[PDB]
Amino acid sequence: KPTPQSTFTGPIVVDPITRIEGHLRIMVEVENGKVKDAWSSSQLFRGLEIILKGRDPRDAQHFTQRACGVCTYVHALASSRCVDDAVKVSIPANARMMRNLVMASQYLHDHLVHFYHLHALDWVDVTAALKADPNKAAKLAASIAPARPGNSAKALKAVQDKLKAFVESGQLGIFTNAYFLGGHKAYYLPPEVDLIATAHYLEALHMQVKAASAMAILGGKNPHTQFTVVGGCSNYQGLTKDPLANYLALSKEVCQFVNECYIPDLLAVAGFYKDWGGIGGTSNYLAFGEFATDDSSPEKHLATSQFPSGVITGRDLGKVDNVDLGAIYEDVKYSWYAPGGDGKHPYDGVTDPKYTKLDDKDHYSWMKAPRYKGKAMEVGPLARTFIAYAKGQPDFKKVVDMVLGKLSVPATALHSTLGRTAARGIETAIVCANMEKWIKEMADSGAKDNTLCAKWEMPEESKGVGLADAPRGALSHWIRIKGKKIDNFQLVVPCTWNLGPRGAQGDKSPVEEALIGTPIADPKRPVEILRTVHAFDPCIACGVH
Amino acid sequence: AKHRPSVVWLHNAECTGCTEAAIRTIKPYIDALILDTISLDYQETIMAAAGEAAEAALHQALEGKDGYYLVVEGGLPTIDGGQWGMVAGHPMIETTKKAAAKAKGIICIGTCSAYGGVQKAKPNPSQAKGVSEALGVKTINIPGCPPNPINFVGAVVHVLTKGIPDLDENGRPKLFYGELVHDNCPRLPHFEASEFAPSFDSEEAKKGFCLYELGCKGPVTYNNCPKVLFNQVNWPVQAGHPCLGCSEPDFWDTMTPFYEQG
Ligand code: SF4
Ligand code: SF4
Ligand code: FCO
Ligand code: F3S
Ligand SMILES: [Ca+2]
Ligand code: NI
């Protein structure tokens, strides 16, 4: 070190932000090589909430699932929980277990793909992998990760030979114009680490097929699962012995990769970029919790989630507050919606599109701005991690302390872009550690009694909320039913919390705040913008819907 | 080293479920396809370049001496001169028009690009359109929400090595979309015997009775789902749930309510 940083003063625009879901434009003002102001500008509107009005409430989960195909399943789950609450049905134990296991499978697939296929190219110079000696890289791999055939000299040379033939063809494909071509001051990894990470990148393309096949045993298919119904689930076959044996076996292979490659790569990258523990922090954290033992009501979900719910404000780990679903609202002042729409709780949500022009500082995003008693909230792995750690959740206490010790940093260093990236791995490891217990619970239960859907009745008028903590954080769906039809259906989505624009007070969202202070080593190739933005795991189709 | 055919992949009004589906391919796996078979030259989900460097990669691909095929994911929002869906400051419709102009061939991956999809469903606030309609050209449609990778990769490889596969009246390759879901359904004997589950909690449901009475659209849906499965393990009806008709044009409005035949 020190952290490289130019003298650049002036604007930077990055559009498209690639390696995310959906269409994001980031605009920053830079002064003397650090970002001094930022704007998160979501560039597509579809309008699922408008589309849903007047439709059968049973249909909502099938429309809302298509808010996003990266976080497939999560919206179908949130809609089903939502309608379940509105008709006041408590799902059978087996449906709670099956819905929660499908969420677990979704965490593993999503987090593996994000780290390798979306985030890693911000930290890993693939073309520098060509400079590495494979025997030296194999020795190094022995010193940073579990022993495995895939990290042998022979295996790493084969990867290097494949990459060499590809680069030498002159058709660079997805690496065309990469920020790391020619070297880059902000890229710190030795060529040996580049080679090791690239080898795992390719293995992960295969491993994610297995993670999705696991999810589909219970889900029916991936992407876009088709096993949830009002009152529980449809998938009786999902409770039987052979499908569960295959589900376990596949989940053990995926988890072996998580422990052998993902966590070791993450920690190796974290070790080299320790300065990134001082960049990109925010102050307030929210989670609805996930993996509950009682999903009979949203109240019970919040209370019994094994990854707990909570609200942390101004980094005070000493005061985890309970979630007040009544205190959530959304603003539209800096958004491309009609005026008069600020401060709306989602039961009274309004979605009235009104575009102005590109880069209008008064209206610059298709995302609404969710706020909580006037404050912006960061959601996602980092939020869940701090909340669980603060609450002494033992799996989180252990895995967090392992990471802090390996990196020799205090817990405060997690309030950062490095911490946000580390929290994603931390929770993946913890989900893995729970899979066999959760699968046994459902197998034994389903063996004894295969009840999977409860009876229910459509009310003439009602409302309900469905909560989930999706891979990206706190997800909530809200319905008003009238004449047995959808009167209102509002989605408030994790990326809406993290990446939306300013709220009615002019206050920056979490990603806008996190971008403040970002050093820019090379304005022509502003990878540091990408590092922080990607650490939030953006999904603009989710954010805007 | 031999040239690999250039593929340009555009994302419009989409959920990225079609990109996710494509990478679930196993014959071949996605890495083999892009290292050995095609040159994937623009793809926003996975490409290394961002911003102006990404836009230049696109430019270089569209200007390539050897020409390129186009894959489009998502429909086109057309209200307010195309401005509700933009990339790099340009309306999606405008960029898709530019790319399609010189394309050797156009493959629409998913029901959105093929037919307009979820954003086109009533009341269609973005005035979203399928590609063929937005551009006024015939497209190779690989619909489904999302389609099976088998069908998409199968079509890509066919187009590169054998020409345009035989298409039905809605642009779908007969290889994959020639047969009704229902005609290959293991619950067919129940349907023939009028043995229908009346609800998801019923003994009939537990016994695997036909899901027609719970809204199954398999009898009007062309797709290969029961035959090839998803993820080598399963399909919706095997998991106890009716077919939504998700490979059919405008299914969001023609196949709803999903849990009824009304
Ligand atoms: S066809 Fe379905 S899966 Fe594909 S982009 Fe459209 S909504 Fe998403
Ligand atoms: S479950 Fe659907 S596809 Fe199968 S026989 Fe019955 S109606 Fe046909
Ligand atoms: N995870 C995820 Fe997608 C977002 N934001 C949802 O919900
Ligand atoms: S919903 Fe779609 S994925 Fe196949 S089973 Fe029916 S066509
Ligand atoms: Ca919303
Ligand atoms: Ni998403």
Burial (0-12, 13-18, 19+ Cβ within 10 Å), A408: exposed
Cα–Cα distance between B37 and B28 in angstroms, integer? 9
- In the stretch 94-133 of chain B, residues with CB closer than 8 A to chain A read 117-119, 121-126, 128
Nearest CA in chain B to A73: B17
Breaks (C-N over 2.5 A) in chain B follow: none
Q: How far is CA A48 from CA A456, B91, B126, B243, in A?
A: 26, 20, 11, 21
Q: In sequence order, what DSSP letters do the residues of A468-521 get, joined into one string?
A: EEETTEEEEEEEEEETTEEEEEEEE-HHHHHH----TT-PPPHHHHHHTT-B-S
Q: Which residues of A166-197 are buried (b: 16+ CB within 10 A; e: fewer)?
A: beeeebbbbbbbbbbbeebebbbbbbbbbbbb
Cα–Cα distance between A17 and B44 in angstroms, integer? 8
Residue A461 token pair: 């008028």
Dihedral pair phi/psi, residue A22, rounded to 5°:
85, -170
Which residues have a Cβ under 8 Å from the Cβ of A77 and sit 6 or more positions away? A99, A102, A103, A228, A466, A468
Number of residues assigned to chain B: 262
Report the SS3 class of residue A302: helix
| Residue type at position A95 | A
Domain ranges of chain B: 1-176, 177-261
Cα–Cα distance between A494 and A67 in angstroms, integer? 12
Q: Please indicate whether, in this complex, the C-beta atoms of A179 and B205 are within 8 angstroms of each other.
A: no
Residue A72: CATH number of its domain: 1.10.645.10
Burial (0-12, 13-18, 19+ Cβ within 10 Å), A143: exposed
Chain A environment of B122 (Cβ under 8 Å):
51
Q: How many helices and strands in chain A, by DSSP H and E?
A: 17, 14
CATH topology of domain B1-176: Rossmann fold (3.40.50)
Degrees, nearest 5: CA angle A274-A278-A279? 110
Mutational test site, ligand 4, from B244, B251, B256, max ligand atoms within 8 Å of CB: B244
Helix (H) or strand (E) segment spanning residue A85: helix A74-86
Q: How far is CA A454 from CA A233, A234, A457, B52, B92, in A?
A: 9, 11, 10, 54, 45
The answer to whether residues A481 and A505 touch, using CB atoms and an 8 Å cutoff, is no
Cα–Cα distance between B38 and A358 in angstroms, integer? 35
Separation of CA B96 and ligand 5 centre (Å): 28
Residue whose structure tokens are 């507050």: A321
The alpha carbon of residue A239 is apart from the nearest alpha carbon of chain B, in Å, by 11
Query: Is residue A493 lining ligand 3, measured as CB closer than 6 Å?
Result: yes
Chain A environment of B96 (Cβ under 8 Å):
none
Cα–Cα distance between B41 and B44 in angstroms, integer? 10
Q: How far is CA B171 from CA A498, B102, B118, B223, in A?
A: 40, 20, 19, 13
Query: Is residue A471 lining ligand 3, measured as CB closer than 6 Å?
Result: yes
Query: Is residue B225 lining ligand 4, measured as CB closer than 6 Å?
Result: yes
Cα–Cα distance between B209 and B200 in angstroms, integer? 10
Nearest CA in chain A to B85: A44
Degrees, nearest 5: CA angle A369-A374-A378? 60
Mutational test site, ligand 4, from B148, B216, B223, max ligand atoms within 8 Å of CB: B223
The alpha carbon of residue A236 is apart from the nearest alpha carbon of chain B, in Å, by 6
Cα–Cα distance between A135 and A153 in angstroms, integer? 5
Cα–Cα distance between A91 and A81 in angstroms, integer? 9
Q: Please indicate whether, in this complex, the C-beta atoms of A209 and B231 are within 8 angstroms of each other.
A: yes
Cα–Cα distance between B63 and A457 in angstroms, integer? 60
Name which of A494, A378, A384, A379 is nearest A428 in CA terms.
A384
Q: Which residue range is the domain that position A521 belongs to? A: 1-545
Query: Is residue B197 lining ligand 2, measured as CB closer than 6 Å?
Result: no
Q: Give the ligand whose atoms come closest to the C-alpha of residue B228.
A: 4
Residue B243 token pair: 């077919």
Total domain count, chain A = 1
Specify the DSSP class assigned to residue A1: -
The answer to whether residues A529 and A29 touch, using CB atoms and an 8 Å cutoff, is no
Residue nearest to atom 7 of ligand 2 (CA): B212
Degrees, nearest 5: CA angle B76-B81-B87? 55
Q: Which residues of B63-102 are buried (b: 16+ CB within 10 A; e: fewer)?
A: eeeeebbbbbbbbbbbbeebbbbbbbeebbbebbbebbee
Separation of CA B226 and ligand 4 centre (Å): 9
Residue A283 token pair: 């102050």
**Strands A369-372, A462-470: pairing kind:** unpaired
Residue A154 token pair: 């022979």
Which residues have a Cβ under 8 Å from the Cβ of A360 and sit 6 or more positions away? none
Query: Is residue B214 lining ligand 1, measured as CB closer than 6 Å?
Result: no
The answer to whether residues A502 and A509 touch, using CB atoms and an 8 Å cutoff, is yes
Residue A29 β-bridge partners: A11, A37
Which residues have a Cβ under 8 Å from the Cβ of B82 and sit 6 or more positions away? B76, B91, B92, B93, B94
Q: Does the annotation list A453 as a binding residue?
A: no
Residue whose structure tokens are 């980092």: A382
- Residue B236 forms contact with A (CB below 8 Å): yes
Helix (H) or strand (E) segment spanning residue A267: helix A263-272
| Residue type at position B55 | E
Cα–Cα distance between A256 and A41 in angstroms, integer? 38
The answer to whether residues B222 and B255 touch, using CB atoms and an 8 Å cutoff, is no
Name which of B21, B19, B20 is nearest B11 in CA terms.
B19
Name which of A148, A129, A147 is nearest A137 in CA terms.
A129
Specify the DSSP class assigned to residue B84: T
Cα–Cα distance between A214 and A254 in angstroms, integer? 9
Positive or negative, the CA dihedral B81, A491, A73, B247 is: negative
Report the SS3 class of residue A245: helix
The answer to whether residues A23 and B77 touch, using CB atoms and an 8 Å cutoff, is no
Specify the DSSP class assigned to residue B141: E
Cα–Cα distance between A276 and A272 in angstroms, integer? 9
Which residues have a Cβ under 8 Å from the Cβ of B112 and sit 6 or more positions away? B12, B13, B14, B15, B18, B73, B74, B75, B118, B119, B120, B130, B145
Name which of A268, A278, A279 is nearest A199 in CA terms.
A268
Residue nearest to atom 6 of ligand 4 (CA): B243
Burial (0-12, 13-18, 19+ Cβ within 10 Å), A6: middle
Cα–Cα distance between A12 and A29 in angstroms, integer? 6
Q: Please indicate whether, in this complex, the C-beta atoms of B84 and A55 are within 8 angstroms of each other.
A: no
Which residues have a Cβ under 8 Å from the Cβ of A451 and sit 6 or more positions away? A92, A93, A94, B201
Which residues have a Cβ under 8 Å from the Cβ of A125 and sit 6 or more positions away? A180, A183, A184, A187, A189, A191, A194
Residue A24 β-bridge partners: A42
Which residues have a Cβ under 8 Å from the Cβ of A368 and sit 6 or more positions away? A330, A331, A332, A335, A337, A492, A496, A500
CB B3: neighbour CB atoms within 10 A?
A: 11
Separation of CA B188 and ligand 2 centre (Å): 6
The answer to whether residues A356 and A362 touch, using CB atoms and an 8 Å cutoff, is yes
Helix %, strand %, coil % of chain A (to 5): 50, 15, 35
| Residue type at position A272 | F
Number of residues assigned to chain A: 545
Cα–Cα distance between A219 and A223 in angstroms, integer? 9
Helix (H) or strand (E) segment spanning residue A135: helix A134-144
**Strands B39-42, B6-11: pairing kind:** parallel
Positive or negative, the CA dihedral A209, A215, A218, A223 is: negative
The answer to whether residues B159 and B69 touch, using CB atoms and an 8 Å cutoff, is yes
Helix %, strand %, coil % of chain B (to 5): 35, 15, 45
Instruction: Give the strands of the sheet with A462-470, arranged side by side.
Output: A462-470, A473-482, A485-492
Residue whose structure tokens are 């199968």: B154
Helix (H) or strand (E) segment spanning residue A426: helix A417-448
Residue nearest to atom 6 of ligand 2 (CA): B210
Q: Which residues of A316-347 are buried (b: 16+ CB within 10 A; e: fewer)?
A: eeeebeebebeebbbbbbbbbbeeebbebebb
Q: Please indicate whether, in this complex, the C-beta atoms of A19 and B50 are within 8 angstroms of each other.
A: yes
Residue B9 token pair: 């992949």
Residue A468 token pair: 């989930």
Q: How far is CA A494 from CA A364, A382, B229, in A?
A: 19, 12, 32
Chain A environment of B124 (Cβ under 8 Å):
51
Q: Which residue blocks in B75-162 are alpha helix, DSSP H? A: 92-101, 111-115, 131-135, 149-161
Dihedral pair phi/psi, residue A523, rounded to 5°:
-60, -25
Q: Which atom of ligand 2 is nearest to the CA of B180?
A: 3
Q: In sequence order, what DSSP letters do the residues of B22-38 get, joined into one string?
A: HTT-BTTBHHHIIIII-
Residue nearest to atom 2 of ligand 4 (CA): B246
CATH 1.10.260.40 fits B177-261, yes or no: no
CB A294: neighbour CB atoms within 10 A?
A: 14
What does the radius of gyration of chain B's CA atoms come to, in whole angstroms? 20
Burial (0-12, 13-18, 19+ Cβ within 10 Å), A362: exposed
Cα–Cα distance between A527 and A531 in angstroms, integer? 6
Residue A27 token pair: 């605009």
Q: Does the annotation list B108 as a binding residue?
A: no
Q: Please indicate whether, in this complex, the C-beta atoms of A51 and B258 are within 8 angstroms of each other.
A: no
